[PDB]
Amino acid sequence: TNLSCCANGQKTIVQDKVCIDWTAAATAAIIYADNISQDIYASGYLKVDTGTGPVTIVFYSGGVTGTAVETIVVATGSSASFTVRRFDTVTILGTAAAETGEFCMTIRYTLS
Amino acid sequence: TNLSCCANGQKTIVQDKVCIDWTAAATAAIIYADNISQDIYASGYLKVDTGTGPVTIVFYSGGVTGTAVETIVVATGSSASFTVRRFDTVTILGTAAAETGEFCMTIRYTLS
Amino acid sequence: TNLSCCANGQKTIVQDKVCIDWTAAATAAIIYADNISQDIYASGYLKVDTGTGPVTIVFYSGGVTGTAVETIVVATGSSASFTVRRFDTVTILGTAAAETGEFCMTIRYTLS
Amino acid sequence: TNLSCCANGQKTIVQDKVCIDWTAAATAAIIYADNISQDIYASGYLKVDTGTGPVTIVFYSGGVTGTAVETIVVATGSSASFTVRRFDTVTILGTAAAETGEFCMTIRYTLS
Amino acid sequence: TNLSCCANGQKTIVQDKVCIDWTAAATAAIIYADNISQDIYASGYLKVDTGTGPVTIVFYSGGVTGTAVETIVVATGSSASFTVRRFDTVTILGTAAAETGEFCMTIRYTLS
Amino acid sequence: TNLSCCANGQKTIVQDKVCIDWTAAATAAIIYADNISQDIYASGYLKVDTGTGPVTIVFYSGGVTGTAVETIVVATGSSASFTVRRFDTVTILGTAAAETGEFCMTIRYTLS
Amino acid sequence: TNLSCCANGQKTIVQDKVCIDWTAAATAAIIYADNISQDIYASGYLKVDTGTGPVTIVFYSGGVTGTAVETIVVATGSSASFTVRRFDTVTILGTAAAETGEFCMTIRYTLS
Amino acid sequence: TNLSCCANGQKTIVQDKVCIDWTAAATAAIIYADNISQDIYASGYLKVDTGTGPVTIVFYSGGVTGTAVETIVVATGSSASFTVRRFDTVTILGTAAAETGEFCMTIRYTLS
Amino acid sequence: TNLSCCANGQKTIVQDKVCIDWTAAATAAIIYADNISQDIYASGYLKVDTGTGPVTIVFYSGGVTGTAVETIVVATGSSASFTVRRFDTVTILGTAAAETGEFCMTIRYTLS
Amino acid sequence: TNLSCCANGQKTIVQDKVCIDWTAAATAAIIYADNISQDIYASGYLKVDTGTGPVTIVFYSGGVTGTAVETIVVATGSSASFTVRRFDTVTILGTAAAETGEFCMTIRYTLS
Amino acid sequence: TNLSCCANGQKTIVQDKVCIDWTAAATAAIIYADNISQDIYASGYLKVDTGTGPVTIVFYSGGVTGTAVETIVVATGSSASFTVRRFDTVTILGTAAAETGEFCMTIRYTLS
Amino acid sequence: TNLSCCANGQKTIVQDKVCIDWTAAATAAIIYADNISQDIYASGYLKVDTGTGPVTIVFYSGGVTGTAVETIVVATGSSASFTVRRFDTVTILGTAAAETGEFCMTIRYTLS
Amino acid sequence: TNLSCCANGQKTIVQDKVCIDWTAAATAAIIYADNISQDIYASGYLKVDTGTGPVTIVFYSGGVTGTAVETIVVATGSSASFTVRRFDTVTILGTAAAETGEFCMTIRYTLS
Amino acid sequence: TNLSCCANGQKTIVQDKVCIDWTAAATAAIIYADNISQDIYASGYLKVDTGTGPVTIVFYSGGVTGTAVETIVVATGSSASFTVRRFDTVTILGTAAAETGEFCMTIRYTLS
Amino acid sequence: TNLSCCANGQKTIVQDKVCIDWTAAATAAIIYADNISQDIYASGYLKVDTGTGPVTIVFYSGGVTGTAVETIVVATGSSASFTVRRFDTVTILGTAAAETGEFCMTIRYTLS
Amino acid sequence: TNLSCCANGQKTIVQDKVCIDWTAAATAAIIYADNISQDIYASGYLKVDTGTGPVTIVFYSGGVTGTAVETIVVATGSSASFTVRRFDTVTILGTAAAETGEFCMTIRYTLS
């Protein structure tokens, strides 16, 4: 209850959502990227719909040649969920059979 | 009511939710993974819809070769619920008959 | 009004209908079969049009050598209606006079 | 507006309809049967078209040797309507003159 | 917005409708009957089509030897409408001239 | 947002409708009757189609020998509308020329 | 958010509608009447279809020998609209040529 | 969140609509009238369909011999819209050629 | 949370809409007028459908001989949109070729 | 009511229908095939019209050398109905007498 | 209920139908072709009417020298049905006896 | 449910149909042309009735010297179907034997 | 569900059809003309029945000395179809041999 | 779904048709006339059957001494089609050789 | 929670939307204008549908001879989106080929 | 709870959304632009629908000749999502084959 002239004062937390359909080649493909790396929390799932051979999802902090903070391998016809913080990019890798599937993610950031 | 210049100050608690459908092979399959292992509380259920033989769900703290903080065995046509803290991955194991079912989970974390 | 990345989310209820004409021998004859045994609700009637001697309709959960969840005996020239859930097959049994009649059924399932 | 991982959650109410023509002997004859006895609400009418002597309709909860939750006696050339809950079978009884008529019923159940 | 594990929770109101044609003898005849006596609201009309002498309609709560919650006398060639709650049976009485007419009723109940 | 175990809680408002054709003798004739006298709101019209001399409609609260809460006199070939609350019966009176006409009414009650 | 045991609590606003065709003599004729005089709001129009000479519509609060809260004079072949509160009856007056027309009105009351 | 026994408490805003067709003589003709003059907001249009010479619409607060709060002159074959508050009557004036057209208006009042 | 007996208290914002078709002569023609000049916000478009030569729309605050707060010139076959506050009338001016077109406007006012 | 940029968003359920006439040799013959194996629900009937000896219908998930999720044997002159999910092909087998009949099927898929 | 200026907004699903008669040579012949390969769902049947030797139908994704997503072999005098997605062309191959038959297909696409 | 003054608002999808008979020379001949190239979806067939040598149909986007989005070669006595989007013209090419046949096409466009 | 007094409101789409027989001289001849140039969509065909030398059809937007939005050249004994929007006139040009043929066109306009 | 007492409410579109045979003198002759000039859409053709010299058809808005909204010149032995809105009369002009022909027209108006 | 008599107190944020179709000449044309320049935020897109050569859109703060706060150049057949604050007018410039297209914009202002 | 006369006080966060379809040439093309560069957070996806060769999306802070805060390369037939802050323009670059696709983006700004 004391007056204070503080501009960068109260901070609110906000949430966003994204949904995409992806097709995987036999090279690492960027599926998501941001620049708010320090304060980000993301939850979601990856579903591998059609194709053969497992699909590998990797979260990178500090570019693709950074640090693999998380890595998941998903078989065809199944799904896998996650929640991760402090990541910069996400890449998917698949066999040269062009697997395809979905990708959903909700994102929290405490800025505006 | 005393002024204090404390940046990492008040912390709010937030909640997320995920839903997936899974198919189980006769090997351990990753169904969920995160990197916020120290402060996470998760509640949910697992339902085994079709197939034969029980399905085993295991929560791991410290990777798959870590410590099984929780393990549940669910028969076909029934369900089982849970709430767990400090876990890193979740894996499902089934018979080589490709059982399939659902997986729902709500996640609490006190960061942002 | 909270964002959630839940794939197996909202489920709708759908309805189908089937109509057939049947002839009954003096052995159990399969008249209907499915594999969605856990969530199925069916309403309908059976009409015995011509022949002699009663016709017996049996609903089975778990194959023909399962459990008779329902059994109805219908005389010639009359009808009988029903509604049943969790059944796997339906069989009709008649005298060795080759009775014949109709069979109508509406089916509800909450999947897609 | 609070996230909850509740599978057997919202329940919808559904309605079905059946129509038959019946012929009555001088013994109790099953005209309708179900196995969803706990949650069922049915409205309809019975019309006695031709024959002599009254026709008696009885609703049974717990098999034919159960409890007569409802009983109506209808004269020839007239009709009678009803609405009933928690019944298992319905039987009709007539004189040995083979009366015949109609039977219509709408069924509500709050499952799927 | 507080979680509560209450099974017999929200209740919906549902509506049904019935229509019949009736012939009246010189004795009380049951024209409608139910067993949901505590929560029922019914609106409708009675039309006396042919015959002579008035027709008397009586609503009973607690069987025919119960309490006449409502009684209406209708002349030939005219009609009369109503809405009533908490009744168990309805009976019609006419002269020994076999008057005939119609009977329509919509029924509300707040169960399922 | 405070939990309360109150059974007779929220109350909904429901609406019904009735339509009839009437013939008027030279005595008061009951055209509508109910037993929910305390909470009822009704709107509608009366149309005098054929005959001679005015037709008088009276709404009674507390039986026919009660209190005439409303009274309208309608000439032949014209109509008159109304809305009324707390009434128990309605009667029509006409000349001994057998006037005939229509009667429509929508009814609101806040019970179920 | 404080518990209160108040029966005559929240009040909802409801709306009704009426439509009639009228024929006007050379005397005041009642065209609408109610008994909810304190809380009523009505909007609508009057159309004079055929005849000669103007037709006068008067709204009365406190019976016909009350207070003319509103009065409108409408020529043949034209219309006039209105909205009025706290009135008890409505009367129409026309020349002795039997003009005829329509009358539509929507009614709001905040009771049930 | 403090209990208060205030009857004339919360007030809701309601909206009505009226549509008419008008024919204009060579004298001021009343086209709309009310008695809720203090709180009324009305929006709409006037369209002059057939005839010759302009048609003048005037809004009056305090009777026809009151104050012309608004006045619009509309040519034949065109339209003009408006929104006005605190008016008591509306009049239209046209040439002695019997122009005709339409008149639509939506009305807001914050009473019930 | 302090009790206050303030009548002109909370104020709500409401929105209206109007649509017209206009024909323009070679003089300024009033197309819209109000008397709530102090608090009004309007958005919309003007479309010039047929004719030749540009059409000029002018918004006036303080009568036609007031202040042109806004002025737009629109060619034939094109449109132009706007949002404006504190205006009293709107006028359109066209060549003596009788151009015609449409005019749509949504109006916000924070009174009732 | 929160904006979300989700492409693979709402999914609708669609239904198709097919009808054919078939002739059966003494080898397995493909009668239906698809590639949407993961989300498909099919209802229908098989009627054996002419020939001798039973006809066997088999549903396969994962090619003909896959898993027989369903198998039905139908005698000549009778019919049999079904509903099945997750199947890839359907084959019919008959005696070397060239039986012939019909095949009807309605197909549901929740993609587009 | 939030305004959004999104052009490529709601998308509807539309259905088309085609029927042809074909004659097959001893080389692959194109029977259907499109360019909306990414979103197409097609159901139908192929009937081999006259000729000798089986007829082979192949669906290609990515031109004729692409990937055979589906292949069916149909004998003479019988039929075969299908539903397929993501295909680019269809080809038929027959013996050098000029078999002939029909081809029906319904096509769904979610564009316009 | 929020008012918006948006002219180019809801868009409907409409369908047209055309049928012609064509004769082919030994030069490219225009058989169809439009100017709504951006939003057009067309389905149909081409039948080669009489002549010798194959007939080639080409769809062009951007004039005849544009891009061949589709090309089909049809033998004599057979047919070929198609569905195509974003095309501007269609041309047919045949041998110098004056083949002749039919051409049917249904056209969808989402404008008006 | 918000009341709005919008006259130029909902617009419907209507369709017309015309058929003629034409004879072509060696000068441009007007074959079709309108004045609703801004919103018109037309589909149809042109058939050249008898004569020699090609016939040229041209669609003009803005009079004959306007802009040739479309031009087609048709040989004798063949036909050509089209769909076009925003055109004002159509002209045909032929050799001085008096070719003759047909002309069919369906017209869509979204006005009334 | 909000009640509204709007008389000039929904408007339907209706269509009429007329056919005549005409003979043209060497003066302008009225061939069609109406008084619904503001909302009329007409499609049709004119065929010049016998005579010499061209025949000129003119559409007039605002009497014969009005504005020629459309003008077409048709040679003998040929035809010309049209669609036009907002016209008042139609006149034909021919050489003093008494040409004769036909005139067909379909008329749309959105009134009744 | 301290009483304060502050009239210009709480301020709400409101949103509007506009949609138009435009045709561009070879001069700057005003497409949007306002007078609330200090607090306005607008998002939307511009689509160039037909024509040749790029179209240039310019946002001006302080009249057309003000400051170009934003400028975008859009090619034919493509679109471009934006969000801008503090602008006064918008102008479009195109080649002398009369390009045409659409323009959608949502507007936020924090006044009323 | 201390009174303070602070105008630029509480700030709310608002969200907008935009959707477009784009066609890419072989030069950088502006697809989005703003002037609120300091406080903007945007999430969305880019989908490459048709064409060949990858499409490159670049976010620029400080004009096109500024700093590439983000850059993503997307192959044909796949998608890529993002969230970015402090950017000024967005550009797309494609091969000279005119690839086309979609672009969706939700925008947050904490001003009004």
Measured from the Cβ of residue G104, the count of other Cβ atoms closer than 10 Å reads: 20
Which position has the token pair 């008599």? O5
Is A91:A60 a contact under the CB 8 Å cutoff? Answer: yes
Give, rounded to a whole angstrom, the gap between the first and last alpha carbons of chain F. 24
Taking an 8 Å cut-off on Cβ atoms, the answer to whether M5 and H79 are in contact is no
Query: Chain M residues contacting L, CB < 8 Å?
Result: 1-2, 4, 13, 39, 41, 43-45, 47, 69-70, 72-73, 75, 77-85, 106, 108-110
Chain M residue numbers touching N109 (CB-CB < 8 A): 112
- Alpha carbon of G3: minimum distance to chain F alpha carbons (Å): 8
Q: Which of P41, P106, P107 to mutate to test the interface with J (most CBs of J within 10 A)?
A: P106
Burial class (CB in 10 A: 0-12, 13-18, 19+), H39: middle
Contacts of M69 in chain L (CB under 8 A): 35
Burial of K90 (0-12, 13-18, 19+ CB in 10 A): buried
| Token output for H28 | 């001021």
Backbone torsion region of residue G77, taken as left when φ is above 0, otherwise alpha when ψ lies between -120 and 50, otherwise beta: left
**CB burial readout A86-108, b (16+ within 10 A) else e:** bbbbbbbbbeeebbbbbbbbbbb
What single letter denotes the amino acid at residue L65?
A: T
- List the one residue out of G69, G38, G95, G24 whose CA is nearest residue H33: G69
Chains contacting C (3+ CB pairs below 8 angstroms): A, B, D, J
Which stretches within chain F are classed as H helix? none
Which residues in chain P have their CB less than 8 angstroms from residue J5's CB?
17, 43-45, 104-106
Element (H, E) at E102: strand E99-109
Centroid of chain to Cα M40: 10
Nearest to C8 among B15, B16, B19 (CB): B19
User: Encoding tokens for residue G2?
Assistant: 């404080």
Q: Which residues of F touch E83 (CB under 8 A)?
A: 16, 18, 34, 36, 107, 109
d(CA P53, CA F11): 64
What DSSP letter does each residue of M12-41 carry, written as one string? --EEEEEEEEEEE-SS-EEEEEES--SS-E
Among I20, I42, I49, I30, CA closest to M6: I20
Long-range contacts, J35-39 (Cβ 8 Å, 24+)? J35/J88, J35/K69, J35/K70, J35/K84, J35/K85, J36/J109, J36/J111, J36/K41, J36/K83, J36/K84, J36/K85, J37/J61, J37/J62, J37/J86, J37/J87, J37/J88, J38/A49, J38/A77, J38/J86, J39/C112, J39/J109, J39/J110, J39/J111
Q: Which of H17, H21, H102 sits opposite N4 (nearest CB)?
A: H17
Q: Do G41 and H112 touch (CB under 8 A)?
A: yes
Q: Determine, for residues I21 and M9 on separate chains, whether the beta-carbon distance falls below 8 Å.
A: no
Buried b (16+ CB within 10 A) or exposed e, E5-38: eeeeeeeeebebebebebbbbeebbbbbbbbeee
- Looking at residue J7, the DSSP 8-state letter turns out to be S
Do E66 and E60 touch, CB atoms closer than 8 A?
yes
CB distance G67 to H17 below 8 Å: no
Distance CA H42, CA H70 (A): 12
Q: Testing the interface with M: which of N40, N83, N87, N111 to mutate, by most M Cβ within 10 A?
A: N83
Number of helices (H), then strands (E), in chain B: 0, 8
Give the chain A residue nearest B20 (alpha carbons). Answer: A79
Nearest Cα to Cα of residue K45 among K70, K20, K89, K81:
K81
Between F and G, how many residue pairs show a Cβ–Cβ distance under 8 A? 71
Please tell me the distance from the alpha carbon of residue P53 to that of residue P51, in angstroms, as a whole number.
7
Residue type present at position D91: T
3-state SS assignment for residue E66: coil
Method: cryo-EM
CB contact under 8 A, M6 and I16: no
Beta carbons of K83 and J107 less than 8 angstroms apart: yes
Give the integer Cα–Cα distance in Å for O70 and O59. 5
DSSP state of O90: E
Give the E:F interface size as CB pairs under 8 Å: 70
Strand order in the sheet with C79-85: C14-24, C99-109, C41-50, C79-85, D29-34, D89-93, D55-61, D67-74
O86, amino acid identity: R
Cβ <8 Å between K7 and P19: yes
Resolution attained, angstroms: 3.0
**Residue O80: strand, helix, or coil:** strand
Chain I touching partners, 3 or more CB pairs below 8 A: H, L, M, O
Sheet strand arrangement including N5-6 = I67-74, I55-61, I89-93, I29-34, H79-85, H41-50, H99-109, H14-24, N5-6
Burial class (CB in 10 A: 0-12, 13-18, 19+), B96: exposed
CB of H53 within 8 A of CB of H101?
Answer: no
Residue pair L101/L11 in contact by the 8 Å Cβ criterion: no
Beta strands of A1-112 (E only): which ranges? Answer: 14-24, 29-34, 41-50, 55-61, 67-74, 79-85, 89-93, 99-109
Collect all residues of chain B within an 8 Å Cβ-Cβ radius of residue C8.
19-21, 102, 104
- Interchain pair D3, C1: CB under 8 A: no
Residue numbers in P near K7 (CB within 8 A): 19-21
CB-closest option in C4, C77, C84 to D23: C77
